[PDB]
Structures are given as C-alpha cells and as structure tokens.
Design a protein around this motif. Structure first.
Motif, PDB file in Angstrom:
ATOM      1  N   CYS A 159      -2.990  -5.704   2.267  1.00  0.00           N
ATOM      2  CA  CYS A 159      -2.208  -5.516   1.371  1.00  0.00           C
ATOM      3  C   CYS A 159      -0.632  -7.060   0.803  1.00  0.00           C
ATOM      4  CB  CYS A 159      -1.031  -4.487   1.330  1.00  0.00           C
ATOM      5  SG  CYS A 159       0.161  -4.095   2.633  1.00  0.00           S
ATOM      6  N   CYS A 163       0.639  -1.241   0.288  1.00  0.00           N
ATOM      7  CA  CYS A 163      -0.004  -0.065   0.218  1.00  0.00           C
ATOM      8  C   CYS A 163       1.111   1.380  -0.216  1.00  0.00           C
ATOM      9  CB  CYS A 163      -0.647   0.429   1.568  1.00  0.00           C
ATOM     10  SG  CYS A 163       0.141  -0.392   2.659  1.00  0.00           S
ATOM     11  N   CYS A 184      -0.889  -5.053   7.695  1.00  0.00           N
ATOM     12  CA  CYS A 184      -1.921  -5.016   6.172  1.00  0.00           C
ATOM     13  C   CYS A 184      -0.918  -5.467   5.997  1.00  0.00           C
ATOM     14  CB  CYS A 184      -2.214  -3.483   5.873  1.00  0.00           C
ATOM     15  SG  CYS A 184      -1.146  -2.624   6.364  1.00  0.00           S
ATOM     16  N   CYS A 208      -5.215   0.883   4.593  1.00  0.00           N
ATOM     17  CA  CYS A 208      -5.486  -0.534   3.946  1.00  0.00           C
ATOM     18  C   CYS A 208      -5.663  -1.805   5.290  1.00  0.00           C
ATOM     19  CB  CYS A 208      -3.805  -0.692   4.007  1.00  0.00           C
ATOM     20  SG  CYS A 208      -3.262  -2.512   2.935  1.00  0.00           S
TER      21      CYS A 208
HETATM   22 ZN   LIG Z   1      -1.297  -1.793   3.365  1.00  0.00          ZN
END
Ligand SMILES: [Zn+2]
Ligand SMILES: [Zn+2]
Ligand SMILES: [Zn+2]
Ligand SMILES: [Zn+2]
Lengths: 145, 94, 68, 277, 48, 48, 98, 248, 148, 193
Positions: free
Chosen positions: I144, I103, I121, I141
């Motif tokens: 990711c 991200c 994330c 996010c």
């Molecule tokens: Zn992320």
RNA sequence: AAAAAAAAAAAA
C-alpha cells in the motif's frame, strides 16, 4: 465460556453449566466426584454476578426483540435489581452483600409509597430503577479488588 | 596510569601459547547507538537495492514498471462488478 | 466371540478374539495360582486354560490365514 | 513448469469433531469423555488420501522463499491449497538435510521418544528407520514393499521380517524417513488394511549395531576432515607413506630425535609453529 | 568466534534485543516443581 | 511371586512380554545414580 | 534389574522416611557394595556424610568398606578427610596409622 | 542475558533484530523455564521463527548451539559426537536428577567445570585401520533369455552388507524402468523386477552373468520371482562363495 | 446517531443520500456476507481480512465521491463520516503525503509491533524481492505504498 | 483451532468483574431505545470492556428521571393490566442469541418518553431525550463531555420538569437538629433523635 | 418510637 473452560480443564464434565449460569450435575455423583467438583466462593460469586448480568442483558434483549415494551422493560429491571436475593443465590458466597439487598428493599419501600398515590393502583409497573442500580454498581466497586 | 600512552605501549613479555569470549560462541558487549543508525544499516543490508547508485527519475521509472505489472486498482466510485475498487489488495502478476 | 473361528477372516476381529482368549487364559492362570483352589477347582482352572489356549490358537490360525 | 495440484477438494475437507466416543465433549482437551474405557484407543482408521509424487508435485508459495519446510498434509495427501500453500509440495531430495531440532515439516523434535513410539521423533537418535506392521501376510510381501516404500526417498536397507507382517525400512536421509512415516501411516498396501508405520527402535542384531556405530564414526570423521586442513589429516591417518615421511622430517625443528607431539605439531593458531593455516 | 568446522572470520554483529510483547491475559505458563534440597556447604573441622 | 512364575511360564512359551512397574509420581533409580554425590578428590590419585 | 530397582526403591523410601537413622544408609550402601556398584555405594555414603558429617561410626564404616575392596588411594583420601573433619577423635587417627 | 547461537543459525544480515522473553519456554533437555531469544531467519515473509531451544546451562553441558542443538566444534549432532568420540556427557539424563544437578552445579558449569581435540585424532587413526566344490563359471544359459516371456525377475547373489539398495537401483536404472528391487542383505539375495522384458534382456546381454558394483562382485541370472524365507547359514555361505566365484 | 432510533425519532439524512444509498447498501451487504465466510480452510488472521478490505472500499468510495468527483455536499460528507459510513481517521491518513493508498490504520501503528516498525506492506515494492507476494497478516494487503 | 487462545481466554476471567461493572454502569436509560458505547476488546475475543464513563448533566438527569416518574405513574394508572416479564427471560438450555441474526437491524420499540409541549417546553424540546444532550452545541465543552453551561429558560424548564424529584426546602433552618452533626452527637451520647 | 460450604452423612 471462561467458566465452561475452567470446568472442562478440571475434567468436571459431569457438571453442566447452562446459559443462565446454573451449575448442575448431569448424573448421580460419587463421594470422590462430589469432593472434586466442590467449587469455592470466587467461582460461585463470579457465576452469580454473571447470572445477574445475564438477567439484566436478557431483559434488554427482550425489549429489543419486541416481545416486551419499554414500560415492561423498566419494571423488569427494577424488579431484578430489587430481587437479587430471590433471583440469584449470590448471598450464599458473600453474606455482607445482604446489606445491599436490605438497602434496595428500603429504597423500594420509599419509592413504592410515593409511586402509588391516588389513581396509580397497586401491582407491577414501577420502573424507577436508578437507586437500586446505583446500589449494585457500588457493590461492584467494592467487590472488584 | 594505567591509561597513559607508555603503559598501553608496553607489550606482554614471554613466549606465546602454541595451543576472552564473554559467551560460549563469541564475545558480546553492551553498546549504545542511536536507533536511526541501526535502522539505516539494517536497511542498507536488508533492502534489495542497498547501494546501487540511483536518482529520483529512474527510481520513479522502476516504480512505474512495477505499478503497471500489477493488476488494475479499480474505480472507488464503482461499488460492484467489473471495475470495482480492489486497491492495495491487488496482487502482482506472476 | 463368534463360534466359527475359521470363518473369521478380518484381521481386527481375529486380533480382538485372540486378545480376549489371552486375557481369559491369564485370568485362568491367576485363578489356578490361588492356593484356595481344591482339586476340582484346579482341574476346572486347567480345563479353562486349555480351552482358552485352544481358542487363541484357532484365532491365531485364522489370523495367519487372513492377516496377522 | 507445473503448479501444485490440489489433492482433495475443500468441500470434503472440514474441521469437525472426532466421532462420539462418550457423552460430553471436553472443549479444553477437545476429547470425548464419558462412556466406557473398553473403547479407549479402539482402532486405527484408514486415512483419507494417499500420495502420487509424479501427479501431486508442483510449486507453491515456498520455492521463492529459501528455508521453507515441506508440507505435512501434502505428505498426508489431504492438502487442498495447492499452489497457495506456504510450504513445499515436492519430494525431499538427498540434499534436503535438517538440523536436529525439527523434522522436514518443521515440527519440533523432542528429548525422548514417546512410549507409543510415533509422532515427530526425538533428536537423541538420528533415526532413519521406520517400523511398519499390520501387513496382510502373503508370500509376495517383499516385492510390494519394495515397490511402495520407494517413492518417498532414497532407501538404504529394507529388512522384511515376513510371517510376522513386519518390515524395517532404513532410508539414507532422515527427512525421507519422516516423509515416509507421515505418508504411509494408515494407508493400504494391496488390500484394505491399516498400516502401523511407526518409529523403529534399535535393531538388537549386533551386526546392525556395529554398522550403525561405524556409520556414526565416519560421519564424525567427515566432519573432522572438513574441520582440519588436508595436510594435517593426511599426516593424521598416515596411510600414505609420503605423508609419514613428511611427518618424520617436518616434526624435528632442528632438534634431532624429537618426534614432536600431536598437541604441538597438529595445532592451529596464529602463534603456532607449523605451516598453521 | 570460529565454530562448526570452518574458521573464516565472520563479520561482527550489532544486535537489537527487545522484550517480547506478552498477552496481558496470559496465566502463569508452567507448574512449580518440588525438588529436594541440595547438599549443604562442606562442613568445617570440629575444633573441640 | 505368582507374577514371577507366570512371567517365567510365558517367557518359556516364546513371547517376551514386557513388564512395567512405572507408576506416576515415581523416580527412576536404575537410569542414573539417584542424587549422585561423587567423592571429594584428595592428594592420592584414584583414576586406576 | 527388577530386584535391584525394588531394593533401591525400598532403601530410598526408608532414607526419605527417616534420614537420621544410620542403619538405612549402612544397609543401602552395603547392599550396593554387594552388586559391585562402587560408585553408587560411594554416592550413598557421601550423602550419609552430608546428613551426618561428624559421625565417627559412618566414617569408620566407609573407610572400611573402601579398604575391603582394595581401593587404597580412595580410602587414604577418605582417612585424610576424616582426620581433617574430626582431629580430636583418636579412633580415626589410630585407624589411620594402623 | 545473551544467547549462545552459532553463525549459521543467526541471520545472514549482520544486524539482528531479536526478541527476548523471560521464562518464555522450558528447556528441551532439563525442562526448566529459561529466557528464550528469538529472531526471524533469512527466509523472509514465511518460515519458522528461529529461537533458542535449550537453556544456557544445558548448552554449556552439551557444548551446543541453543537453536540447532549441534556441536559447536565440528557441526555434529550431540549424540553422534558422543557415540563417535566416547565422551562422558557430563550430567544425569534422568528426570529428577537433572533438576538436582542443575540446582547444585549452575555456578561451576558457568566457569567451565564439572576439550576433545586429541580424541578426534584418535577416532581418525582408529578409522585409518578400519578392518570392516566351487560352482563352475557361468555358462551361456545363465544370461540367454528364456523361452518363457512371463519370466521377468533378475536374481542377484553375492551382495555384501556394505552395498546399499540405491547403488543397485541407479546401476540398473540405465537399462530401463525398474518396477521393483528387493535387496535382502541378511540372505545376500536380490530380485529385480522390470516393467518391460527388453530392459531385462539388455541387462542380461551387457552383464553376461557377472557384475561389479562398488568393488563388490555379484552374479546375475534369470529367475521367476520366489520369496526369501528363514534360510540356513550354510546355504548363505555357499551362495556368498558362489557370488565371489562369479569372478574366478 | 449510530444508535438506532425506532421510526418517529429518526431524523432524515441530508439531501443527496438517496443517490448513493444503493451503493451504501451494496457495501453493507458485502460486509454482512463477509461476516458469514467459512474460517475452516484459512488461517485465523485471514478470517478478518475481508472486513478491513470492505471498510477500505466503502471509505474510499465516500472519500473520492467528495474529494475527486465532488458529487456529494459537505454536509452529506460529514453526516456519512459521523454515522459510520466511512472511517474518518483512515480518510485523514489518505489526505497526507505518503499515506494516500494506506490499507488500514493498524498497519501504521508503530507502537504495537515487535521492533517498532510499520507493516511490511508499507514498503515500496522496488525495495522488496522479486517473486515475493507479501500478504499482510493484519489485513491481507499486498503493498500500500504510495508509489505502488 | 483455538487451543492457543484458551489459556489467555481463561486468564481474562481475572478481569471479568470490571467488564461487568463497566457494562452495568453504561446501561441505556428508559428514554433510550439503544445506546452506542465505546469498547476495548481483546483481539482473540476473550474480554469486552465498555470503555466509557456515564457522564451526565445533573439538572438534565434529574429532569429526565422526573419525566420518567410522571410517565410511569400515568401509564400505571392508564394501563388495563400490567404484565410482569418472566425472570429468567430465556430458558436455561436456550443458546445465546447472535447479534447479527436476531437484534442487529431489528426495529426497536419506542422507549418511555414524556410528550413535551412544543411551546411550554420550548427550551429543551429538541434535545431533552438525547443520549448525551447538547454535545454538539456550545453548551458543553466538547465531545469528551466534561463541563456544561445552560441558559435561564433551559434551567427553568429543567427545574419545572424535575418537580416530582426535587426538594422544596429553601430554609436551612428546616434541618435544625436533623443533620449530620446532630446525628453524630446523638450517636456519641447513645440517644436517638 | 419497632432486633433473615465444611466437619456430616468413607483404596484393578
Ligand atoms: Zn497495506
Ligand atoms: Zn545453531
Ligand atoms: Zn493494513
Ligand atoms: Zn500491513
């Protein structure tokens, strides 16, 4: 915003700091209010340095808006660095700074006497601001600790 | 001495109390371990899936179902409208 | 404060009037406690205290009628 | 199921300055300054929303997480997030108990009360009593209080000191008491009034004092009975005659006429001389 | 150890303790309190 | 004295007005013993 | 309680103002003895003994104040402390044997 | 250099990631700055960062966890434990005396100077020996429905102080939807206002003027709702006797 | 140069810029709109999420126009990376094994977390709980990891 | 909402002098319409520090300010009436101008620049008025901008452009008894040259 | 052979 927050934390809301860094009472102050609101040399020195910085930044903002052109910008910068004792009350809180003012005046004389020779008549228009700008940077070097 | 085996082997004489800890709630001592050991054990406890024996292909399969549960990522060469790139900010359907 | 105590039905206005009357009664009692008050001054202080008590009673009656 | 209903639209919910009670807004303390001190606290306004538990309840992004606190603004009726709120948007049940450092909304509880006795509260008193005043003095106070002080939790005892317009509602749960205090403050009962729902002090009635002292004593007794083994406590009260006979026969250990002390008999450990544990 | 009633042996713990990242701009958080002096050490016998 | 008689007079007339003398910068001398220094125990038991 | 608080405030302000004068400690401790606050009077006398360790008059008055309220074991501990601190003051020994 | 935190305040994970801040906060009892230890609870991804709320010296004085502030022997609040066990509370609770005692005693408090066990048994034994013209029996007119359909209230007399409102509420919840239930334990009175008259009629039909709730005998009648005011002790005693006389 | 030149000292962009210029101004206007998004209803850290999202979207547009479709020249790509139309370090992470869908950069700055971790994330979704809609405090996010 | 920032905000007052110096040392020159600087900023918005050192090639800086000297002299000769700007530029009660609504995409006016000859000034023509000239060329060590090397036509062009502000003294014998050693000697003897 | 604040305007 830091100066305004420091003023408001100390409950001195009868003092107004305007955007050109002038501290004025909004009303008539009593003796107790005048004794509480009397700031020191650190606050006032920092305020005046912020005022000079605001003058320089505002000159560049006036150039970027289109109100003045680049020659006017350079002449104004050279005027501002040469007139700190007139445009600020900065000397009132650190008086050895007068040396710097004297230095700028000396530089101005030399620059001006080499700038107006022949067709270059007297008046505004000298934008050779680098020596006075140097002088105030070395002042800042000294004044930071 | 007093670190030999016969010194550690002898017990404390006398009867036992019919009725210690470093801190108020238990005993805590300073210890030295690798960072990877603590991270791996904390990961084994923390991760839902710590243990449960699993090879790469069915883990990829679980990843595939998890990916198709999510919204469409979009096209990055579409800058506006339907099909625009959302990416890692795509939420999981529930 | 309004002259018509009975017409007041608002709880906060009646409470403010009762508080003002109580403050006036306390000020009258403090003035009467002063030894410099002569017979006429003590009579005036007693009359002011009685008037403040009557105003507070009217405000409290209006409050008890309409919230308080 | 049912998602959490958005109570107030975000168009009506902003973050603006308080009404101007001065000349200069102090930005460090976020309070108006200047003017006159005759204004000061002025008055307590009427709040911008009430709560219907049957209508506003639902699920948020908090039923998935264990240990999530209840929502202060859902209790205040002005929570616009709905299902996107990070806190619970339901009524506290009877099993919603909290430690003596936080309320049901997660705000930290204090050492002592404040003099204007409101706010989060103090952990030096397990206070389940809420003090409500500023009620429009009529003859049907009790019915409307029992109707409206009932959707916030389960209630032990409401004593309505009528004529004064004052009632003291004691819930069985402290979290329900905090929810009711944060929900009914600056609300209206039947007419346009502002209720002063504050934290109750202590009922000077000696009957209430001995009731509270006793209830504290069986709460501690419940904790001790949870701590001790069942046979141990059953010998400790000794209301059961068979338990008394077990104490007489067991606390002999060969030597007759001993009647072993409670320090030796009622002892827990690996090296004790008892069935232990 | 055992606490709050129950006496089951809980599993022993490995605890990572890290100093918290502090804002470099933060001023001192608390005021200084002027507490009066405590009593001195217990005075000795007077050996005249 | 005048505050005492007016407090007694308003005490007789039903209401119990709370009296407060708690200025700022002020210590509480009635809550606990100020700077309590308990006597040193000796050879004689003094619990009775 | 208002009278007790005001008297305690006055006595503590006199003690804070001039702690090297024994009369302030004596008056505060005697007054707190008069409302039967024996723990408070004991604390005041022990604080005075912290300010004036080797004062024989303060020791004598504190033993006497302990004795006149029929606290025998407290006063005997006090006399043991007094003859421990000042073994060359015959007044304390004479009071202790008497 | 290590907090004194109970197991239920600690994470379920046996491996604890903990932050430590020197002078991070003031103690919630003595208001002195102290080293704060903090950790993330089992409520992953939102909740509250659990932390030591009080200092270690106050945790020795109170014998409590630094996070939950409950007794570390029974799991009780400190004031509940102190009221129900009559403990000394070893330390002043005033403003300046707190810092004075902490400044002058922080080395003896650490060594356990300045064990209830038996007092818990004393409390259990004390609660073992706890010690907390008559009107005719009700005729048929008491539980027969009145001719006035506007009559809705059900009056209960004989209520003791040990009976909570919720027991009455869920005892009468099985008959219908209750609009209001007013229980005054000071006057031993209660008023039940339903929403439908059928529920009140069923309550009168299957109660028949008498009730027993948690061993407490009560008397039920039809009633138009009237308020309960400042009422005489003799009248309270005689309707308490009447509520006892509901079961002759 | 990211610094503005008036009109006569401006040099023209490389060829092919006018084909993607409309989408570049779409991203620029999206970011300018993200500057004026009310913060009154959302937490403070949530006020900065759309700027990271739009920076990711614009960098991804440039990245997959050059590397997947190859519809822009290399000179145009380096001019876009040099003139602030794409984040070169985020693109550099996107070309690595395991960081292809990352991200933002601040979510792998391990030196600036409490326990020297990455963001939550970064974790694959299979090792996270069900009904756990995580939403990164750095950028918003929702996961990711490359397998997601 | 920002109360939790306020103390931190006020604490950064302690480090506002460096920021001022940093800003004042990285101000654009008269031949730049605008400058991009690297800044280190607090995440709560309390302190922006310009994280640059204004490194220049000294022959290039000399030639650039010599061209400035020429251009300002020529303009002060040519202009009908030079109007001095008003100090302070804005009123005391005027709020600070937002970057996004006032300056951000605004057409800058052209800066002070000497018009170089395309053939006489051929060695410096394409890079003379850049902010960091030749930074992408092998005339510098790299983007950190720490070492320079220049060819003979470039140094000749820079020397010719510097003739308003360059010394014409070649002989060090010019400084006989007018140097630091003689000034210090005269200071020691309390005499003045 | 060419030097430019405080005292001091007083605790409901
Ligand atoms: Zn992320
Ligand atoms: Zn705990
Ligand atoms: Zn990120
Ligand atoms: Zn992240």
């Amino acid at each position: 915003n830091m100066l305004n927050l420091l003023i408001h934390r100390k409950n001195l809301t009868y003092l107004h700091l305007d955007y050109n860094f002038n501290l004025k009472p909004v009303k008539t102050l009593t003796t107790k209010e005048r004794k509480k609101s009397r700031f020191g040399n650190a606050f006032h020195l920092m305020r005046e340095i912020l005022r000079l910085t605001k003058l320089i930044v505002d000159a560049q903002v006036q150039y970027r808006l289109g109100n003045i052109d680049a020659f006017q910008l350079a002449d104004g910068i050279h005027y501002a660095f040469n007139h700190v004792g007139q445009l600020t009350g900065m000397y009132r809180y650190k008086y050895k700074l007068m040396h710097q003012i004297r230095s700028c005046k000396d530089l101005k004389h030399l620059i001006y006497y080499r700038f107006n020779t022949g067709p270059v008549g007297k008046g505004p228009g000298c934008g050779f601001w680098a020596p006075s700008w140097r002088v105030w940077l070395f002042f800042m070097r000294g004044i930071i600790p | 001495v007093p670190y030999t085996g016969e010194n550690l082997a002898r017990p404390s004489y006398g009867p036992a109390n019919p009725f210690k800890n470093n801190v108020l709630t238990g005993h805590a001592e300073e210890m030295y371990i690798s960072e990877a050991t603590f991270r791996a054990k904390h990961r084994a406890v923390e991760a839902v899936g710590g243990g449960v024996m699993r090879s790469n292909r069915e883990m990829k399969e679980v990843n595939k179902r998890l990916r198709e549960m999510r919204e469409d990522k979009g096209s990055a060469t579409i800058a506006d409208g339907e099909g625009a790139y959302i990416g890692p900010w795509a939420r999981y359907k529930r | 404060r309004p002259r018509v105590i009975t017409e007041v039905d608002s709880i906060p206005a009646c409470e403010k009037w009762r508080g003002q009357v109580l403050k006036e009664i306390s000020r009258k009692v403090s003035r009467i406690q002063d030894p410099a008050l002569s017979d006429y001054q003590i009579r005036d202080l007693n009359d002011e205290i009685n008037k403040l008590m009557r105003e507070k009673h009217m405000w409290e009656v209006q409050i008890r009628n309409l919230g308080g | 199921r049912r998602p959490a209903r958005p109570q107030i639209d975000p168009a009506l919910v902003k973050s603006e300055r308080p009404p101007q009670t001065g000349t200069v807004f102090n930005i460090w303390y976020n309070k108006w300054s200047g003017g006159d001190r005759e204004d000061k606290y002025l008055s307590q306004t009427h709040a911008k929303g009430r709560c219907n538990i049957a209508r506003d309840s639902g699920y948020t992004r908090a039923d998935s997480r264990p240990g999530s606190y209840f929502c202060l603004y859902f209790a205040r009726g002005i929570c616009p997030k709905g299902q996107d709120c990070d806190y619970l948007h339901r009524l506290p049940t009877i099993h919603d108990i909290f430690n003596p450092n936080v309320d049901c909304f997660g705000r930290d509880k204090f050492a002592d009360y404040r003099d204007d006795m409101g706010g989060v509260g103090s952990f030096n008193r397990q206070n389940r009593t809420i003090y409500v005043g500023r009620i429009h003095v009529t003859d049907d106070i009790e019915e409307i209080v029992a109707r409206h002080f009932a959707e916030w939790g389960q209630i032990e005892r409401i004593r309505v000191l009528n004529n004064r317009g004052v009632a003291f509602i004691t819930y069985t749960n402290e979290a329900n008491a905090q929810f009711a205090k944060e929900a009914m403050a600056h609300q209206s009962l039947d007419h346009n009034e502002i209720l002063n729902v504050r934290w109750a002090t202590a009922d000077p009635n000696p009957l209430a004092q001995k009731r509270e002292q006793r209830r504290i004593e069986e709460q501690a007794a419940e904790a001790i009975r949870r701590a001790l083994p069942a046979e141990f406590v059953a010998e400790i009260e000794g209301k059961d005659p068979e338990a008394r006979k077990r104490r007489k026969l067991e606390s002999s250990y060969g030597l007759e006429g001993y009647e072993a002390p409670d320090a030796v008999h009622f002892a827990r450990g690996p090296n004790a001389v008892n069935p232990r544990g | 150890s055992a606490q709050m009633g129950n006496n089951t042996k809980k599993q022993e713990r490995i605890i990572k303790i890290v100093e918290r990242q502090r804002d470099p701009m933060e001023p001192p958080k608390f005021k200084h309190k002027k507490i009066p002096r405590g009593p001195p050490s217990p005075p000795p016998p007077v050996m005249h | 004295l005048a505050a005492l008689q007016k407090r007694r007079e308003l005490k007789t007339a039903g209401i119990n007005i709370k009296i407060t003398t708690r200025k700022k910068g002020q210590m509480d001398y009635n809550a606990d013993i100020p700077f309590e220094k308990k006597p040193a125990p000796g050879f004689y038991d003094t619990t009775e | 309680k208002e009278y007790q608080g005001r008297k305690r405030r006055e006595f503590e302000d006199y003690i804070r103002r001039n702690r090297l004068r024994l009369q302030n400690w004596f008056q505060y401790a005697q007054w707190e003895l008069e409302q039967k606050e024996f723990a408070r009077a004991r604390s005041i006398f022990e604080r005075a003994l912290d300010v004036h360790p080797n004062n024989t008059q303060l020791w004598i008055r504190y033993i006497e104040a302990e004795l006149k309220n029929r606290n025998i074991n407290h006063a005997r501990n006090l006399l043991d402390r007094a003859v421990t601190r000042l073994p060359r003051v015959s007044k304390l020994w004479y009071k202790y044997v008497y | 250099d290590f907090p004194s935190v109970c197991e239920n305040c600690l994470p379920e994970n046996p491996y604890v990631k903990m932050l430590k801040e020197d002078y991070g906060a003031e103690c919630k009892l003595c208001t002195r700055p102290f080293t704060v230890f903090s950790w993330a609870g089992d409520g992953r991804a939102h909740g509250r960062k659990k932390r030591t709320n009080i200092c270690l010296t106050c945790a020795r004085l109170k014998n409590a966890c630094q996070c939950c502030i409950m007794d570390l022997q029974f799991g009780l609040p400190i004031v509940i434990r102190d009221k129900a066990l009559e403990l000394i509370a070893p330390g002043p609770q005033s403003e300046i005396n707190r810092e004075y005692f902490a400044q002058n005693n922080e080395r003896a408090i650490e060594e356990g100077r300045a064990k209830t066990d038996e007092k818990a048994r004393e409390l259990l034994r004390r609660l073992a020996n706890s010690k907390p013209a008559a009107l005719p029996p009700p005729g048929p007119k008491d539980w027969l429905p009145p001719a006035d359909k506007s009559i809705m209230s059900l009056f209960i007399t004989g209520i003791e102080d040990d009976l909570p409102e919720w027991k009455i509420r869920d005892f009468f919840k099985q008959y219908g939807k209750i609009k209001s239930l007013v229980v005054s334990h000071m006057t031993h009175c209660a008023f039940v206002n339903y929403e439908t008259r059928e529920g009140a009629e069923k309550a009168a039909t299957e109660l028949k003027g008498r009730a027993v709730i948690a061993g407490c005998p009560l008397r039920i009648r039809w009633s138009i709702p009237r308020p309960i005011g400042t009422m005489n002790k003799e009248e309270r005693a005689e309707m308490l006797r009447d509520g006892r006389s509901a079961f002759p | 140069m990211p610094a503005i030149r008036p009109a006569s000292k401006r040099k023209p962009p490389p060829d092919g810029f006018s084909d993607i210029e409309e989408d570049l101004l779409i991203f620029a206007n999206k970011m300018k709109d993200a500057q004026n998004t009310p913060t009154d209803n959302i937490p403070k850290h949530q006020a900065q999420w759309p700027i990271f999202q739009i920076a990711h979207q614009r960098s991804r547009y440039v990245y997959e126009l050059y590397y997947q479709k190859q519809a822009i020249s290399k000179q145009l790509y380096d001019w876009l990376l040099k003139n602030g139309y794409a984040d070169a370090m985020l693109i550099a992470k996107w070309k690595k094994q395991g960081y292809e869908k990352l991200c933002c950069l601040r979510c792998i700055q391990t030196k600036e977390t409490n326990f020297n971790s990455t963001c939550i994330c970064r974790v694959p979704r299979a090792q996270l709980k069900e009904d756990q809609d995580i939403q990164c405090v750095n950028c918003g996010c929702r996961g990711c990891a490359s397998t997601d | 909402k920002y109360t939790s920032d306020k103390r931190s905000y006020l604490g950064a007052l302690k480090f506002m002098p460096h920021a001022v110096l940093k800003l004042l040392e990285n101000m654009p020159m008269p031949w730049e319409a605008a400058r991009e600087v690297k800044v280190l900023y607090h995440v709560n918005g309390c302190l922006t520090l310009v994280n640059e050192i204004p490194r220049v090639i000294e022959p290039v800086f000399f030639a650039q300010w010599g061209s400035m000297w020429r251009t300002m002299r020529k303009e002060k000769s040519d202009r009908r009436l030079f109007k001095r700007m008003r100090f302070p530029p804005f009123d005391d009660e005027e709020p600070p101008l937002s970057w996004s609504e006032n300056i951000e995409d605004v057409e800058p006016l052209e800066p002070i620049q000497m018009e170089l000859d395309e053939d006489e000034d051929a060695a410096v023509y394409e890079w003379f008025y850049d902010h960091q000239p030749l930074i992408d060329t092998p005339h510098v060590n790299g983007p950190s901008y720490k070492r320079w090397n220049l060819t003979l036509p470039q140094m000749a062009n820079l020397y010719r452009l510097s003739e308003p502000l360059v010394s014409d003294v070649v002989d060090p014998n010019y400084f006989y008894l007018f140097e630091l050693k003689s000034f210090l000697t005269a200071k020691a003897l309390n005499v003045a040259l």
